[PDB]
């Protein structure tokens, strides 16, 4: 390269073998992606099948105990372990794999391997985009859920007391984590989460509306009732009428796209911005910087007991979550909370 | 020959020359909606407090009564009315009509008619522009969601007070109480809906990144790439073969969309069918079908209860249930 | 390269981008005003 | 906070709005 002889070496041989067409492309990123992602997925599937949670959370979280696909999870370590990395050679496991599975080290294994697998996969998109000479907008978009994974599974438990309050890898455990932020943080009320919700809903709207608009503004190209066979990949003509689409959406919605590149850039921009804002909100929640209450409304409700709002209803509901959650959610607190102090409404 | 008044009015209504197409669906869409917006702005600004639970405990909900934008909400109808129809003429005074939540019913009815006729008008403009008409079929999913959360759930629970409050904090209250009642997180239809919106964001990012990444070089680096696209052109603006090859060597070769028509159909069909499923999940929860119940499922050989993540979700449901409508329950079983 | 700067560029922002900017600022203000006012 | 938030909201709704208006008019007056 660059009018130089460039004497061939083992690095060039390795690059030539790694950048070759096959079923699954490897590249250099495959030296990290394939083991990291394979071990993360296999560790999650092994924890959801055999590895229990009886000592970390006092819970059943695997198929071998009777849990199904929804209720099984790779559980987070105990809060007394703090933010320990829980290596199998660490001071906690000390070489014992069987006790390492019971100590919750599988969560740290799966989480770290999944984070490195995300790094490797986005490096894989970078390397493939450089191989075929395309811009890496794919991994510019894939920067968003890596940031989300980092902020949720790493930054939030790092800011809190320990990996115990990290999300356990599983369906119902994620639901518990979600209801935990409802009750303890009022994560719905957070404006960064509000922007994240807006971004995801707008991205779903954009995907549905773009697919419907393209498929309903198609050209004939027919002599056949099935339009899917009316397409040729090797051509340089548009198959859906952008002019007709713009006219339809201008006369229905008021505004319409006139630039395909700007349309697709917007379809990229909305979910990435929403997910990044949600990541910033979870980083805020990592330090318990919650948008939990409106102080002026709180003083008004305290000094005037006839002032009820849905926000005050949400505050009471979150108090109910914390009270009826803490005793069986945080076993390290040993909260043997009696019945008479638990908040409870009229009858029910 | 088009001289008579009705022929002229019909040609003006069906005219595609207007800035916004009206149509025979628009002749219902426009006045019903503008009614709904007018009363919604007025109620959100200066709505007096509404006794939502029927227990003579009113909820302000409006900005002039001490609400901000997040906390401001048009409060649902009084529980005493239930599913009865409450227009202004069925009330003796505007004061009690506002106290009993009549604006909520008026907005909900006008909004349902407006979205239905908006879907009809979308079909009508697709017809008058020579287009394929299934844009309204795609739009049938948010319409289904709105109908499920504004009419179908009040029908199933027997009271319009049970619908989604017209706001943000009211929306969160609806979701929290709804989780308490039905355990929506543990429902397959809601799970498909969540997978649909997550995949919709994923596929929007995928398609946008693939097309914006594969645009043909027609400009320089000191001008915006959008300036490379000229509206009304017939020449393609991106390399479909390069994008498909990139996706094929990225994920899978034989499991990739080499046809743009099939790709765009998939983009259209996935979030739409998933939102259909989650709207039907809400509507089935309206008749109290509920999500998966796994409370005390894992039991040991001695019969002691082994708690799970579903049991922690049960604890959350208990915390919401004992707190929702804290004075409206004179009895234990929450059958209403 | 000469006495005038060779990297003289013109900044562009069309009316649609103006629409997007105005909507972004106003919607961000509407969302965050309840929290700034507290 | 009852009026400092008002001042912050005012500055936020004007300064980038004014900046965007500068750029928009700078483009609109040029053909």
């Amino acid at each position: 390269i660059g009018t130089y002889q460039e004497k061939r070496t083992w690095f060039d041989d390795a690059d030539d073998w790694l950048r070759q067409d096959r079923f699954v492309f490897v590249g250099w990123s495959g030296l990290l992606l394939l083991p990291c992602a394979y071990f993360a997925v296999g560790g999650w599937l092994t924890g959801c099948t055999f590895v229990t949670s009886w000592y970390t959370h006092g819970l059943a979280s695997s198929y071998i105990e009777g849990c199904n696909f929804l209720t099984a999870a790779v559980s987070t370590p105990a809060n007394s372990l703090g933010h320990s990395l829980l290596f199998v050679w660490g001071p906690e496991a000390q070489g014992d794999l069987t006790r390492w599975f019971q100590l919750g080290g599988l969560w740290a294994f799966v989480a770290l391997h999944g984070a490195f697998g995300l790094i490797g996969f986005m490096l894989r998109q970078f390397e493939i985009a450089r191989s075929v000479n395309l811009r890496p907008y794919n991994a510019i978009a894939f920067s968003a859920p890596i940031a989300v994974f980092v902020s949720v599974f790493l930054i939030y438990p790092l800011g809190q007391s320990g990996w115990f309050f990290a999300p356990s890898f599983g369906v119902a455990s994620i639901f518990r984590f979600i209801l935990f932020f409802q009750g303890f943080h009022n994560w719905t009320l957070n404006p960064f989460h509000m922007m994240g919700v807006a971004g995801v809903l707008g991205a779903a709207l954009l995907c549905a509306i773009h697919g419907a608009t393209v498929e309903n503004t198609l050209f004939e190209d027919g002599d056949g009732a099935n339009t899917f066979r009316a397409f040729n990949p090797t051509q340089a003509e548009e198959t859906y009428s952008m002019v007709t689409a713009n006219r339809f959406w201008s006369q229905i919605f008021g505004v319409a796209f006139s630039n395909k590149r700007w349309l697709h850039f917007f379809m990229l921009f909305v979910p990435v911005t929403g997910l990044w804002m949600s990541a910033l909100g979870v980083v805020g929640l990592a330090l318990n910087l919650r948008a939990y209450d409106f102080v002026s409304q709180e003083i008004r409700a305290a000094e005037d007991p006839e002032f009820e709002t849905f926000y005050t209803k949400n505050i009471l509901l979150n108090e109910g979550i914390r009270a009826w959650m803490a005793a069986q959610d945080q076993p390290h607190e040993k909260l043997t909370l009696p019945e008479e102090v638990l908040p409870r409404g009229n009858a029910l | 020959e088009n001289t008579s008044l009705w022929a002229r009015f019909c040609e003006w209504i069906t005219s595609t020359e207007n800035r916004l197409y009206i149509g025979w669906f628009g002749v219902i869409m426009i006045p019903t909606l503008l009614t709904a917006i007018s009363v919604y702005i007025i109620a959100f600004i200066a709505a007096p407090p509404v006794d939502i639970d029927g227990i003579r405990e009113p909820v302000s909900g409006s900005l002039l009564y001490g609400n901000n934008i997040i906390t401001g909400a048009v409060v649902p109808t009084s529980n005493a009315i239930g599913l009865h129809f409450y227009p202004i003429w069925e009330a003796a005074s505007l004061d009690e009509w506002l106290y009993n939540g009549g604006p909520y019913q008026l907005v909900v009815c006008h909004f349902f008619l407006g979205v239905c006729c908006y879907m009809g008008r979308e079909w009508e403009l697709s017809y008058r522009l020579g287009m394929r008409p299934w844009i309204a079929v795609a739009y049938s999913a948010p319409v289904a969601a709105a109908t499920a959360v504004f009419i179908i759930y009040p029908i199933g629970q027997g009271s319009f007070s049970d619908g989604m409050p017209l706001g943000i904090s009211g929306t969160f209250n609806f979701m929290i109480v709804f989780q308490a009642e039905h355990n929506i997180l543990m429902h397959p239809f809601h799970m498909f809906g969540v997978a649909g919106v997550f995949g919709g964001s994923l596929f929007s990012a995928m398609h946008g990144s693939l097309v914006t990444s594969s645009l043909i070089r027609e400009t320089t680096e000191n001008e915006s790439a959008n300036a490379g696209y000229k509206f009304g052109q017939e020449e393609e603006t991106y390399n479909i073969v390069a994008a498909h090859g990139y996706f094929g060597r990225l994920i899978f070769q034989y499991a990739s969309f080499n046809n743009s028509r099939s790709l765009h159909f998939f983009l259209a069909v996935w979030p739409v069918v998933c939102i259909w499923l989650t709207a039907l999940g809400i509507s089935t929860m309206a008749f109290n079908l509920n999500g998966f119940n796994f409370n005390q499922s894992v039991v040991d050989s001695n019969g002691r209860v082994l708690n799970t993540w579903a049991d922690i979700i049960n604890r959350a449901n208990l915390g919401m249930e004992v707190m929702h409508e804290r004075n409206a329950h004179n009895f234990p079983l929450d059958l209403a | 390269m000469a006495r005038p700067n060779p990297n003289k560029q013109v900044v562009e922002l069309n009316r649609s981008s103006l629409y997007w900017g105005l909507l972004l600022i106003f919607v961000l203000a509407v969302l965050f005003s309840s929290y700034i006012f507290n | 906070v009852n009026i400092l938030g008002l001042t912050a909201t005012a500055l936020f709704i004007i300064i980038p709005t004014s900046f965007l208006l500068i750029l928009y008019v700078k483009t609109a007056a040029s053909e």
Partner: peptide
């Protein structure tokens, strides 16, 4: 005093929506 700020922000938002709908740049079709 907060309510007037809220109502002003929302009427400005509806003004921007009406402005973007009815006084947009026409497509050039060239």
């Amino acid at each position: 005093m907060e309510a007037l700020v809220y109502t002003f922000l929302l009427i400005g938002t509806l003004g921007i929506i009406f402005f973007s709908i009815f006084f947009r740049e026409p497509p050039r079709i060239a």
